Design a binder for these strands. Sequence first.
RNA 1: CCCGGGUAGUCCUGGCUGUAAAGGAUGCGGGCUAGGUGUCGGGCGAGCUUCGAGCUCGCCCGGUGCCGUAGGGAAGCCGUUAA
RNA 2: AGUGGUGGCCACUAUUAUUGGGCCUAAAGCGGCCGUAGCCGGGCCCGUAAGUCCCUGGCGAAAUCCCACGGCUCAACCGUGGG
Lengths: 60, 61, 227, 155, 129, 197
Amino acid sequence: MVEMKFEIPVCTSCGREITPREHATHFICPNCGEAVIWRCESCRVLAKPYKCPNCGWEGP
Amino acid sequence: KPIIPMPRSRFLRVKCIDCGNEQIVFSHPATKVRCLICGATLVEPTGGKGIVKAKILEVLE
Amino acid sequence: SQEWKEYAKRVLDEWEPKTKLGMMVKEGQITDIHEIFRRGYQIKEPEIIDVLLPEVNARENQEVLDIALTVRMTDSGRRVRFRVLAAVGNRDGYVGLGIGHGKEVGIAIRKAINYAKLNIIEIKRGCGSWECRCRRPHSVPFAVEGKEGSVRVRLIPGPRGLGLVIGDVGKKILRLAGVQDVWSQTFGETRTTVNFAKAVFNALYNTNRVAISPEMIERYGIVVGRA
Amino acid sequence: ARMHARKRGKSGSKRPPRTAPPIWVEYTVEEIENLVVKLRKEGYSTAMIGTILRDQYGIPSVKLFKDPDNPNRNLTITRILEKHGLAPEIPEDLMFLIRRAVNLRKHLEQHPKDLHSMRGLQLIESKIRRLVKYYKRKGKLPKNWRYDPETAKLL
Amino acid sequence: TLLDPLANALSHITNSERVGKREVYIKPASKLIGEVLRVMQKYGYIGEFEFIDDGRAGVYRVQLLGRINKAGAIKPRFPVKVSEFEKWEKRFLPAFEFGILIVSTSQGVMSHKEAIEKGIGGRLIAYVY
Amino acid sequence: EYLVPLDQYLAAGVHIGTQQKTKDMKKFIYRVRQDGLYVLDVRKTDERLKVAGKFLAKFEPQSILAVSVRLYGQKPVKKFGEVTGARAIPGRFLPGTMTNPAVKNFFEPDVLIVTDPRADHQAMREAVEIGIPIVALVDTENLLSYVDLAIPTNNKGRKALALIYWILAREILYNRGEIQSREDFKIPVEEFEMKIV
RNA sequence: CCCGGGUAGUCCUGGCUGUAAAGGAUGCGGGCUAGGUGUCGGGCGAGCUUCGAGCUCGCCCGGUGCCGUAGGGAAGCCGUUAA
RNA sequence: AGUGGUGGCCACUAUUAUUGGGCCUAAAGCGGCCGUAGCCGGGCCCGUAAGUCCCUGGCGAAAUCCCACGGCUCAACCGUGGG
């Protein structure tokens, strides 16, 4: 029986995992344009700033 | 609201008009600042900052 | 199993994808069910899930919890209406709950099951008891609390082979969730079946909310969905 | 300011986190003692003495100066008064409340029908009594010492 | 009026991380607060923590890693020996060996797991999971 | 380094905000006039529109949809969508657009652009119910909730409204490689404006 | 119930009675938790000022409404002046 | 080879709330304030070590209770041993 260990995504702004029916978003980096930035619903509602992992660009 | 509370009030090194007395005064006095020699008023304690009447020479933190 | 694949192919033939999510589950670049949950799209077509999880259509994988008989009323009569609460789900960590309005029994049943399909969610499982520690997802990985209406529910991990010690509503919901042993504590009015069921559902969903380091993933054999 | 009014107004004030005295001050530790005793022999309390020192003489705080007579205690105007037979046996803070209570009591004697002032008295004597109890705990007051209005008239 | 710095601090941390801020400042800093802050950081719950010399009572600065679910100070300092320790794990933690507790034993403030092998009782101080 | 002259930026009224502010916005604030108006930082507006230029052309032209409801934003968005081939819906955003499959215009963009968050609450709510990122034009009073990209600007003046989408379309064609230089962009700023009849 | 009269009362001095949907139907102290929005008091920074805080905009403190993110509640609703 | 009725006790009950309840609208904050005992109390250093914790000597009978073995067909019951 194969154990298909998927990689549950994690938000960048806070680091919390993404529950199934969350209204989270995933989009390409705003300055390096290759890193995927996740944003969880809690991070989305109050719109706390996020930082890129690659270029260190800051963007709400 | 800062983590640490700083004091807004400063101190002033002030030269007097008449007798040229050099003094250190508080930015928010409570009484009338009387010069040592001539005795004339220098700073007027108001609701906010005191109203200096002599000439400022240098601010001090 | 093979019958389920046959039904999956049948629906793949018949169904035409309307919502954006339809294409990549018809085209076939999505095969994992958890692909839907991880990214966070929305589901509106019932055909999306049975392609990946046809087992929902089994009669043992669908259950009718209650048949409420509500009444609107006017000057010229009391017009009845059926509200059926029913649950569907595979027994490997994917379950959905649904409430269906209707004018006949069958209509409400159909609508309820259809809407339940859309309420599919992913259930973490594990073994967090103080006596079992077997690292198999036979129960909840940790104690969890769910709230809905007045009703509050606390699910505590329990040892293997204990069975589900909980009200019959939670009993059925967890039995369709691939969980076998759990201690249950219920606060509030448990006679209202609907709020109880929804609270159990929300607790199961809240299981995924707890932050976990990999050490306990090993320690309790935590499985995100299918084991 | 919340013990009675329970109003959270903060007219308080801010001091810098200074450990050493300021460099720009010119008066040495010996001159400040002379100045404060000069002001005190005039009949100024430590609070107003300090206000004058910070106001015109421009010294931020005596507490920023370390005691020559003790390496582990900051110099205080009260301590300086004590150093030269000028500290008051009754601390100023309670003495002021005593005199206020006495004068108000005269006003109530002349005006029996003002119950608002009656309540003001009722609370300010509780203040006096609380501080008296505190000093009895600390011992600055004699153990037998107990405020009495007739004796307070003498004071 | 303030009564206990520690419980206030732990509530501060929890409430600040529910919304999910990054840097949290605790006003009433004391030595025991620092000894506490050592423990969970040794378990990687928080990032850096450091002390800032304010001038009145000191401040504690902490970076939050978004790891803790609930962190609270059990008030009534229950003294607990060793062999009965499990009776309290069922009261403050969500699962078998999930999270930690803080005890002030004879040898200082320190995690509960490290006390089992050290074989020391003491009074429960706080908990976090 | 500006994609447009700064004097023309001032003339278009982008820097002009209202007498309102929000704490989430405070970073973009430049100053408050002596009357109460709050002024943006044109430099940050330039950087943000540059980043948006990088973004928007990456996606497919047909999968991008924009909606406006403001009277002065209906023609700029239409011109924008025509230029970049992006779908446009001016005026009343019909409820159930991407949230109701059975609606005739059931279109599900991978990205949405918003003129005023206050005007089109229905639009972002339905965009959330599908779950896509968001681009928004935020003036001094708008709320930053659910804003993956916020562009400081004056979204009331028609001149600024035209100029913003003019610049954005130019950057779209820059990034997609269709148009190479600014001088190649012959469409004037007046083409996006709202013609007061 | 409406109308015309009318004693105690309603007023002053001394005392008693200790009462009300005396309701915010919310006991009091501290700390933490998105914001917007006006007036009252004090202070400050600017501009106007026939130079009287006289007048306009921002900020800090205290009290005083409304709206409202999350959150809570059976809901009504509360939501930093917290339920 | 039991089975029913009734009465007393525990659970069901978080309807006794230490673990663990509520008090705006459902029973439930006294009209308000002051204040004694009691209870709960700021930061740092030094000492003491009463509480607190670890180790160790004496001690809480038998009977009952948990477990292995053995005896009575087994069991219950009894003993040997450990708790």
